[PDB]
Amino acid sequence: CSPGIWQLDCTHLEGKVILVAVHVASGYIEAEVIPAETGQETAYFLLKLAGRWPVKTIHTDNGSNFTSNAVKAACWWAGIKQGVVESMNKELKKIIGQVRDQAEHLKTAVQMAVFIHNKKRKGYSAGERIVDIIATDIQ
Amino acid sequence: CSPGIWQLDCTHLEGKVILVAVHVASGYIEAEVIPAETGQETAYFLLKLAGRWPVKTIHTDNGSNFTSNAVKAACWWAGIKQGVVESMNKELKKIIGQVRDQAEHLKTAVQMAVFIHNKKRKGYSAGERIVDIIATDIQ
Ligand SMILES: Cc1nc2c(ccn2Cc2ccc(F)c(F)c2)c(-c2ccc3c(c2C)CCCO3)c1[C@H](OC(C)(C)C)C(=O)O
Ligand SMILES: Cc1nc2c(ccn2Cc2ccc(F)c(F)c2)c(-c2ccc3c(c2C)CCCO3)c1[C@H](OC(C)(C)C)C(=O)O
């Protein structure tokens, strides 16, 4: 897929919200545990994401997620416009379950699962693929 | 410099704490506004960082930052061992000052400054250099 496309969705676990961003072309994930599912939290997440990777386009399974003025302002400022994703989210949810008792806080288990997911060789890992896709696109 | 070396330090602004991670070889920055300067916050930041980039070694200007059991546990689990940095932190502090009135929250201004810093061409940007350094190291 195009190297600037990311998918963002929230999932719920233990009464908390996990914002999951998938780089569609590599399967690479960025995730954070947010206090609430709000436009301000999504906007802040998008600003962080766009400063770290070249974010061109964002996709989601819940269109209404992107209607706040806060989200529209983040996309405006950062210059963002509006199978794999289902699979990557499924893998992450499974990994969180597998490491959950190794940590007190869900947020810690989430970051351990992101780490495991991005480094797992499938033969390259999602972390290796994103860096290869973005470097070759710059070239 | 070696591609797995990162420098982590905290700086203070408006009574808040900004954790700044610099990828020494590229000048690329990752930053977060943390509620307090604690071992638990540093450990959590390191886990997130290590799941996104291949973190081999961490440097700091304040050695005591890395003594908590929480930090030692994050480095153990993620397999981490213990001019440019001064310049990158200086540039970020200047950029935050330059964009500060464009946002209500300091954390928003911080992420705008990270974005500006990583995308600025110096001729490649810090964001372009990190992806090139890591991709060629995998190759
Ligand atoms: C806190 C916050 N609110 C925002 C927005 C945007 C709309 N609103 C709603 C609103 C409503 C009434 C107002 F009087 C008012 F001033 C803003 C940004 C925001 C979001 C993204 C963003 C920018 C802004 C200002 C500036 C350029 C980079 O991208 C904010 C913002 O905070 C979050 C990122 C946490 C949402 C902020 O700190 O100002
Ligand atoms: C909350 C937290 N505390 C930690 C630690 C480690 C030591 N301590 C102190 C402590 C003291 C007394 C205990 F009875 C006790 F159980 C742990 C991790 C932590 C930090 C990093 C880390 C791991 C753990 C458990 C597991 C493998 C991946 O890396 C935590 C941890 O929370 C933060 C990351 C926010 C610090 C957690 O959720 O358990």
Q: Return d(Cα A116, Cα A131) in angstroms, integer.
A: 17
Structural domain span for residue B27: 1-139
Indicate which atom in ligand 1 lies nearest the CA of residue B109. Answer: 38
DSSP for A96-137, written as a single string: HHHHGGG-SSHHHHHHHHHHHHHH-B---BHHHHHHHHHHHH
Q: Residue B109, SS3? A: helix
Torsion angles phi and psi, residue B15, rounded to 5: 75, 15
The CATH number linked to B123 is: 3.30.420.10
Long-range contacts of the stretch B120-127 (C-beta < 8 A, 24+): B122/B27, B124/A138, B126/B23, B126/B26, B126/B27, B126/B28, B126/B29, B126/B88, B127/A52, B127/A53, B127/A54, B127/B28
Q: Give the one of A115, A132, A135 whose C-beta lies nearest to B47's C-beta.
A: A115
Q: How many domains does chain B have?
A: 1
Residue reference for tokens 């999951």: A20
The pocket around ligand 2, CB under 6 angstroms, is made up of A 102-105, 108, 112; B 40, 43-44, 47, 69-70, 73-74, 77
B108 ligand 1 Cβ < 6 A: yes
Q: Return d(Cα A132, Cα A43) in angstroms, integer.
A: 27
8 A C-beta contact, residue B81 and residue A17: no
Long-range contacts of the stretch B70-76 (C-beta < 8 A, 24+): B70/B39, B70/B40, B70/B42, B70/B43, B71/B39, B71/B42, B71/B43, B71/B46, B73/B43, B74/B42, B74/B43, B74/B44, B74/B46, B74/B47, B74/B50, B75/B46
Q: Give the one of B47, B107, B132 whose C-beta lies nearest to A44's C-beta.
A: B107
Q: Residue B54, SS3? A: coil
Q: What does the DSSP 8-state code read for residue A93?
A: H
